[PDB]
Amino acid sequence: MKCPVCHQGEMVSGIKDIPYTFRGRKTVLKGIHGLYCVHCEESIMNKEESDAFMAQVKAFRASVNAETVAPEFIVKVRKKLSLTQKEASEIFGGGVNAFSRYEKGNAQPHPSTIKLLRVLDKHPELLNEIR
């Protein structure tokens, strides 16, 4: 309907498909009312709307959280201890397209690297006492 905040699209109520994930566990919350149609930035949602979108994204988030770890933790550990793609591979075993696949969770088949990273975030020297 308008957008005097950014002047990009037109915040207008119109439920649609909200793909929370697009890497593996893609879970679209088909039915997210609010204010959108062309843009995807200046969006607005009320209590009910937020409750729905949240209830969904949350339900899936948790259900999926049951897995080993998240695609954010791993990368976070590699960027936290400055574990270059070379060192992390020589110690953990990321490989080549690690960061990439790992980002989506395709290279994180619950290997050993994960068990090392989780304990590495707290022990930036473990990699040296384990390598």
Secondary structure (DSSP) of 11-28:
--------BS-SSSS--B
- Find the helix or strand (DSSP H, E) in which 50 lies: helix 47-65
Backbone φ/ψ region at 77: left (φ over 0), alpha (ψ -120 to 50), beta: alpha
Is residue 59 part of an annotated ligand binding site?
Answer: no
Q: Which residues contact 73 (CB under 8 A, 6 or more apart)?
A: 117, 118, 121
Q: Which residues contact 72 (CB under 8 A, 6 or more apart)?
A: none
Do the beta carbons of residue 14 and residue 36 sit within 8 Å? yes
Q: Is 70 exposed, middle or buried, given 0-12, 13-18 or 19+ CB atoms closer than 10 A?
A: middle
Residue with tokens 């990273």: 117
- The DSSP symbol for 41 reads S
Tokens representing 39 are 């843009």
- The DSSP symbol for 37 reads S
Strand, helix or coil at 8? coil
Is 62 within the bounds of a domain? yes
Is 91 within the bounds of a domain? yes
Is 21 within the bounds of a domain? yes
Tokens representing 78 are 């590699």
Do the beta carbons of residue 9 and residue 39 sit within 8 Å? yes
Is residue 37 part of an annotated ligand binding site?
Answer: yes
Give the closest residue to 60 by CA, choosing from 22, 103, 108, 20. 20
Do the beta carbons of residue 120 and residue 127 sit within 8 Å? yes
Domain count, the chain: 1
CA distance 84 to 103: 15
Is residue 40 part of an annotated ligand binding site?
Answer: yes
Is 4 within the bounds of a domain? no
Is residue 105 part of an annotated ligand binding site?
Answer: no
28 φ, ψ (degrees, to nearest 5):
-75, 130
Its domain, for residue 131, covers 13-131
Q: How was this structure determined?
A: NMR
Is 5 within the bounds of a domain? no
Is 2 within the bounds of a domain? no
Is 6 within the bounds of a domain? no
